[PDB]
Amino acid sequence: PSDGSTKSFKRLGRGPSSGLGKTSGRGQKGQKARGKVKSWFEGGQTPIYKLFPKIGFTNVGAKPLKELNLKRIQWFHDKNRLHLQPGEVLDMNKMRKLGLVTGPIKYGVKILASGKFHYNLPIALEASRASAKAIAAIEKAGGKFTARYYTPLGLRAHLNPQWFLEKRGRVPLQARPTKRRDIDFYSKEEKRGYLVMEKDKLLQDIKEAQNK
Amino acid sequence: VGDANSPTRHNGGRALARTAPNDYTTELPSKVYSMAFNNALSHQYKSGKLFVIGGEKVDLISPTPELDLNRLDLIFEGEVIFRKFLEEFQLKGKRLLFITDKTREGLIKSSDPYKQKVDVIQKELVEVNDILRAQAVFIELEALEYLAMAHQKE
Amino acid sequence: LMKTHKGTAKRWRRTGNTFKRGIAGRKHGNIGWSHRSLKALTGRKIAHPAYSKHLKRLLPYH
RNA sequence: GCCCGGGAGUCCGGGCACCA
RNA sequence: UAAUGAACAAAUAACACUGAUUGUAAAGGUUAUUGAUAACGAAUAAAAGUUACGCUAGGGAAGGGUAAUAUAGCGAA
RNA sequence: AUAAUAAUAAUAUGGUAAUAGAACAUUUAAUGAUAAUAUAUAUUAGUUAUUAAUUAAUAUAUGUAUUAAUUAAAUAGAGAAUGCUGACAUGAGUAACGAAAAAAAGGUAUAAACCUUUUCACCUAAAACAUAAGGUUUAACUAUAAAAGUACGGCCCCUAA
RNA sequence: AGGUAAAUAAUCUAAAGGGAAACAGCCCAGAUUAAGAUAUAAAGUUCCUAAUAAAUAAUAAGUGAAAUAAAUAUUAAAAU
RNA sequence: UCAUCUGAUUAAUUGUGGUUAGUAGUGAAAGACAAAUCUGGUUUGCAGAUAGCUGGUUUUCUAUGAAAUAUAUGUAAGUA
RNA sequence: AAGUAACUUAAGGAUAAGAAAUCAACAGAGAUAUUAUGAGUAUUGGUGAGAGAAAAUAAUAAAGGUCUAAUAAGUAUUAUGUGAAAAAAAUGUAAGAAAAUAGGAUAACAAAUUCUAAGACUAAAUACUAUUAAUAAGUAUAGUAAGUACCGUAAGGGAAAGUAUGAAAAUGAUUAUUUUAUAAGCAAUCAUGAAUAUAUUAUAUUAUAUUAAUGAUGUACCUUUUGUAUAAUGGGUCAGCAAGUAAUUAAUAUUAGUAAAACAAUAAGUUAUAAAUAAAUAGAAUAUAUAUAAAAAAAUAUAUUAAAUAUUU
RNA sequence: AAAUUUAAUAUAACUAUUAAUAGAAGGUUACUAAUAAAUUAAUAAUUAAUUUUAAAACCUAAAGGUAAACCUU
Ligand SMILES: [Mg+2]
Ligand SMILES: [Mg+2]
Ligand SMILES: [Mg+2]
Ligand SMILES: [Mg+2]
Ligand SMILES: [Mg+2]
Numbered sequence A: 001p002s003d004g005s006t007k008s009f010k011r012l013g014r015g016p017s018s019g020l021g022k023t024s025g026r027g028q029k030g031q032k033a034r035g036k037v038k039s040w041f042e043g044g045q046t047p048i049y050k051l052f053p054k055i056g057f058t059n060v061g062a063k064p065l066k067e068l069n070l071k072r073i074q075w076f077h078d079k080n081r082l083h084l085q086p087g088e089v090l091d092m093n094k095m096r097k098l099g100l101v102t103g104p105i106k107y108g109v110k111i112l113a114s115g116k117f118h119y120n121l122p123i124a125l126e127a128s129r130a131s132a133k134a135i136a137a138i139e140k141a142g143g144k145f146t147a148r149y150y151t152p153l154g155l156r157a158h159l160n161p162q163w164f165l166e167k168r169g170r171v172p173l174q175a176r177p178t179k180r181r182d183i184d185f186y187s188k189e190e191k192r193g194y195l196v197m198e199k200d201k202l203l204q205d206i207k208e209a210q211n212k
Numbered sequence B: 001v002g003d004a005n006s007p008t009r010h011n012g013g014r015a016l017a018r019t020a021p022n023d024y025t026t027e028l029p030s031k032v033y034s035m036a037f038n039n040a041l042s043h044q045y046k047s048g049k050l051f052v053i054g055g056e057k058v059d060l061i062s063p064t065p066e067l068d069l070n071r072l073d074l075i076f077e078g079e080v081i082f083r084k085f086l087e088e089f090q091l092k093g094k095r096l097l098f099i100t101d102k103t104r105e106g107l108i109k110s111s112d113p114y115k116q117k118v119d120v121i122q123k124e125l126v127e128v129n130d131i132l133r134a135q136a137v138f139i140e141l142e143a144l145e146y147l148a149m150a151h152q153k154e
Numbered sequence C: 001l002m003k004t005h006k007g008t009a010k011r012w013r014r015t016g017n018t019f020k021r022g023i024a025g026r027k028h029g030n031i032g033w034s035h036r037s038l039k040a041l042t043g044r045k046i047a048h049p050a051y052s053k054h055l056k057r058l059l060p061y062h
Numbered sequence D: 001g002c003c004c005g006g007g008a009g010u011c012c013g014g015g016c017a018c019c020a
Numbered sequence E: 001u002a003a004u005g006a007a008c009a010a011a012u013a014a015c016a017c018u019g020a021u022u023g024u025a026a027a028g029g030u031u032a033u034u035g036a037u038a039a040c041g042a043a044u045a046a047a048a049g050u051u052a053c054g055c056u057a058g059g060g061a062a063g064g065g066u067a068a069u070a071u072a073g074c075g076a077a
Numbered sequence F: 001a002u003a004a005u006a007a008u009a010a011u012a013u014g015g016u017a018a019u020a021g022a023a024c025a026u027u028u029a030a031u032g033a034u035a036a037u038a039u040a041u042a043u044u045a046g047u048u049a050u051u052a053a054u055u056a057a058u059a060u061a062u063g064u065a066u067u068a069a070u071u072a073a074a075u076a077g078a079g080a081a082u083g084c085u086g087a088c089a090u091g092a093g094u095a096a097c098g099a100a101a102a103a104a105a106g107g108u109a110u111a112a113a114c115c116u117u118u119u120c121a122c123c124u125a126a127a128a129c130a131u132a133a134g135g136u137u138u139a140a141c142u143a144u145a146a147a148a149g150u151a152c153g154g155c156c157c158c159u160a161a
Numbered sequence G: 001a002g003g004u005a006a007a008u009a010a011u012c013u014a015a016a017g018g019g020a021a022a023c024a025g026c027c028c029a030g031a032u033u034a035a036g037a038u039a040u041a042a043a044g045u046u047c048c049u050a051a052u053a054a055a056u057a058a059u060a061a062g063u064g065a066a067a068u069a070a071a072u073a074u075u076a077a078a079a080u
Numbered sequence H: 001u002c003a004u005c006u007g008a009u010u011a012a013u014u015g016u017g018g019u020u021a022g023u024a025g026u027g028a029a030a031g032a033c034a035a036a037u038c039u040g041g042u043u044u045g046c047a048g049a050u051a052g053c054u055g056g057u058u059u060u061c062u063a064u065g066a067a068a069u070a071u072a073u074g075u076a077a078g079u080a
Numbered sequence I: 001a002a003g004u005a006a007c008u009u010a011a012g013g014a015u016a017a018g019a020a021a022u023c024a025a026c027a028g029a030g031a032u033a034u035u036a037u038g039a040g041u042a043u044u045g046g047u048g049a050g051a052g053a054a055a056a057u058a059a060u061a062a063a064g065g066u067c068u069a070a071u072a073a074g075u076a077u078u079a080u081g082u083g084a085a086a087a088a089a090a091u092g093u094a095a096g097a098a099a100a101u102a103g104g105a106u107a108a109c110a111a112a113u114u115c116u117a118a119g120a121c122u123a124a125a126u127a128c129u130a131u132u133a134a135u136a137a138g139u140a141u142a143g144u145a146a147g148u149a150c151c152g153u154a155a156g157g158g159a160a161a162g163u164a165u166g167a168a169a170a171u172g173a174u175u176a177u178u179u180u181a182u183a184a185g186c187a188a189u190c191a192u193g194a195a196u197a198u199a200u201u202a203u204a205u206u207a208u209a210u211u212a213a214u215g216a217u218g219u220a221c222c223u224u225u226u227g228u229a230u231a232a233u234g235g236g237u238c239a240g241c242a243a244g245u246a247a248u249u250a251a252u253a254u255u256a257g258u259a260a261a262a263c264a265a266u267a268a269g270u271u272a273u274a275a276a277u278a279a280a281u282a283g284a285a286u287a288u289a290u291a292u293a294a295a296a297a298a299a300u301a302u303a304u305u306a307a308a309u310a311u312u313u
Numbered sequence J: 001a002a003a004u005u006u007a008a009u010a011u012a013a014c015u016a017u018u019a020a021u022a023g024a025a026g027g028u029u030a031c032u033a034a035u036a037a038a039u040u041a042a043u044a045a046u047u048a049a050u051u052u053u054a055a056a057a058c059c060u061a062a063a064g065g066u067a068a069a070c071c072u073u
């Protein structure tokens, strides 16, 4: 094997000169020396876990988005690993195909402005949302961002509809937003949401309902 | 004294016994394995104990002779032929490895008298150990190509 | 397999390398004490090195 | 802390929660 | 320079923070406050005795030292 | 700009609990020449800063290494458990040989102990004679313990608990 | 009190070697392996037992000679 | 075992068979007996119960090398 | 601990389960069975000890769908007592519905989705046995004897022991060499005469080996201890056997492979790539600029982060 | 040209895995508890497959008893 790969393991209770002779690294006569005592036992003083107050909650309704910086995109472009004349919109699916966004995507991607100062690509971008700064940068570039909504299943479909096609000769259509918060978000102009930038039917319907 | 099963006493059990099916299996990154395979092949080639056999796929400079084919295949006569070949090539006692594109049954039959020193392996099941072990390897061209494709690089 | 100590999880939360926790001592018996003094007993606090090992063992997946 | 019994007040005795 | 008490579980208010199909809610959280564990870092909401009928694991987690007292002797009277 | 070996100068080299680094023996798996002038194990004497290996002589195998070496692994090393099993000691040729009456002659120029005769003794409301139960048939034995029944038992009939 | 409780330093614990008759803890000194010529430490130098010669006083009790026993009494000696 | 001593027509002794026992019988009651001995048998199993306790833990060579303090502890033979 | 051991009952070659009064989320899927991931996540606990899903995606699997009910009340449901540490479906006791224009499914209600209870059958993957075949860094104390001998009244417990060979030791007798009857103590080490033995270079005034003249030095070993020659623990001697191992995870290190990606590449998924906050629709140009948190009109102030002709971490 | 060795195989070991296939007599002592074919294929004897066929004491909760291997019908 390569130098530095392997060591000899320590052999206990095998004669004195070895170094780990009779007591074999345990010392003398304790509970530790024979019986098992949980490593993190505190002696009976209230433990670090039991002392402090328990805090917060886990928002299960939460959906953490994968972050993706403009800088990375720019780098990719520079490299020439970014092929977007065929598909004018760089959607999440497209990103994943490229490598752009790697690993699994559960909820969606948020675009973030890390290298906004050095970003200059007149491109149509789609993602689950983007920071204000990023959006501004994109607009400066002469690009076009819109923020879309995808439910898990919908997102999955988007990412690779090929699989869906293979399975049941069809792709599942995109769900509307239903959570009020989500709806609100997509309505918002500053967030650059797909409800107002595309002028969706849902919003209109809601308005009608409100009226009557 | 307790029960008579203590490992302290001659008739008793064994301390820290190993139990039924022991699992010694380990992992290796696929890429690393591929690299190793490639390395083995390279070593073999350097030795000059790599011999490739083939014909149908590539244009031949010299024309394939009669009474002999490129399939890696053959009292039964085949066995005799094999023996003759061995005699010719000074590789009687040494171990050899035939890496084959498909189950050349005839070849295997011919070789089985010399089973102790002869490995005959299907393409997909060839092992690094088997190559390394073998004093001389005989591989089909197609098989070789397949192997290369498998352990490419990308 | 090995599992998180849920109590510890509830108390502690992972921030980069270390863990954060709520200060103890603020639940009651607060009156009469100066509110400027009690400001210190609010807020989070970072794990002392002494006990980091223990924390790590407690919550192996954080 | 709340409710009684001996307009407000005092002084006494019952309960009813709190009991981590 | 003393004048004090952790977490947990309850309770009251504020926060707009999540709202398990959506909307409400419930519930949780954030902030502020409440009552005690005086064996006072608090084992449980809740707990006293006896065994010379006892049993298990262990530990020792008259001699030696001293001469207060005792006996004996001295100096002074 | 490394490694191996050798110099020169310097500093350092006790060690329980403990940490760190490096080796050897044993056994198994992968690869593997060789050879009865060889090998393996043993004894004795050498050799190498030596738990090891090697040399020579000797003795016993064995047509001969899982052999050298590198890896992989371990039921991988024992004076310490009032350890466990086996063997053999020590006390030791010591205590004891378990209620006690033996003698001669002859079986048998084989007998304190077996048998026979005689003498003597012991038990005798027993150490006798009949039996029940019990049990490696121990017996006067394989050529072996004999029943229609009446101071013969079972089974059989009849029931008790 | 070879007691007990803490403070400071050392040693022992975990430290072999020389000395302290023998000796955990005292006095010196820290053993990688030898070798044994030269400095030596603490301790010693009649013999046991490695190594010694002097000088000036005092002691006559074996006091004393590696573990100092007190008040006091007697006798002497110096100084005023 | 020997001697001595007590009951010896009775609440006597004894043969043969049967019934009652393991949260559990029987007991003129001693916690006595329930197959050489029980404040509750034995066997099999749970079972490698658990033990802050005792003992034990096997080759060699090199380098470094402590502590017996503070704080907390139903804690003081333990552990942080 | 654990619905585990145990006891009891009943069936079959397998049994159980099984074609949604199921999951889900407004997009959808489409029986069970149990393996990867999801995930040690949600959920939960004297919020201690600890316990812990489902959807979804993958495998394994077989043709997997298909009527045998004139479609189902003392049933659903409610009250109350129980009831797989998290997710109900069950159940004792009494109250007790409705016709697809109807029921069930979520603390509750309103919307909306979805399924149709009180009738049924069901191969395959699976469990266990037995045989055959293959593979053994498995066993000769896990290598066939024997459930025998023997032990116990009984339930019950339970041996030795293949064949060769054998200069292994402990242990006994004997012989040789040597030392030993004026000498006292871990029986050794060092010094040091003498005697004997062997040696095909003892040429010798030799070399080795054996041996209690004689001298000096020398409180067995382990354990446990502040400390042991201790008259503290343990061992009669020898031979054999007798103790840090495995599984599933987590964190650190070293080296290797690949590298802004890595593993796996069926699809998933895991970690990394962005810090912060309880959480939320918030999130990066020398710092004095910026990001997040508390605060706020915006800054300041505190904490942590990012940011310096180039080639991203 | 026969022997020797090496590796594999038995009616003749168990254990673990993987793959296939299938879902099965003990004792006791004696008046001891046995066999007989056919058909088909292979080559009259033949071996195999497929078959029919004789015997088979006593005991092993439930002809009915008992103290298992006995008795009574
Ligand atoms: Mg050590
Ligand atoms: Mg101790
Ligand atoms: Mg110990
Ligand atoms: Mg300890
Ligand atoms: Mg208390």
Ligand SMILES: [Mg+2]
Residues within 6 Å of the ligand: E039, H074
């Ligand atoms: Mg307390």
Ligand SMILES: [Mg+2]
Residues within 6 Å of the ligand: none
């Ligand atoms: Mg109490």
Ligand SMILES: [Mg+2]
Residues within 6 Å of the ligand: none
């Ligand atoms: Mg005393």
Ligand SMILES: [Mg+2]
Residues within 6 Å of the ligand: E064
């Ligand atoms: Mg005394």
Ligand SMILES: [Mg+2]
Residues within 6 Å of the ligand: none
């Ligand atoms: Mg050292």
Ligand SMILES: [Mg+2]
Residues within 6 Å of the ligand: none
């Ligand atoms: Mg061992």
Ligand SMILES: [Mg+2]
Residues within 6 Å of the ligand: none
């Ligand atoms: Mg031994």
Ligand SMILES: [Mg+2]
Residues within 6 Å of the ligand: none
């Ligand atoms: Mg030893």
Ligand SMILES: [Mg+2]
Residues within 6 Å of the ligand: F083
């Ligand atoms: Mg022993």
Ligand SMILES: [Mg+2]
Residues within 6 Å of the ligand: F094
């Ligand atoms: Mg005697």
Ligand SMILES: [Mg+2]
Residues within 6 Å of the ligand: none
């Ligand atoms: Mg005598």
Ligand SMILES: [Mg+2]
Residues within 6 Å of the ligand: none
């Ligand atoms: Mg005698």
Ligand SMILES: [Mg+2]
Residues within 6 Å of the ligand: none
């Ligand atoms: Mg006699």
Ligand SMILES: [Mg+2]
Residues within 6 Å of the ligand: F111
């Ligand atoms: Mg005679």
Ligand SMILES: [Mg+2]
Residues within 6 Å of the ligand: none
């Ligand atoms: Mg008479």
Ligand SMILES: [Mg+2]
Residues within 6 Å of the ligand: none
């Ligand atoms: Mg008689």
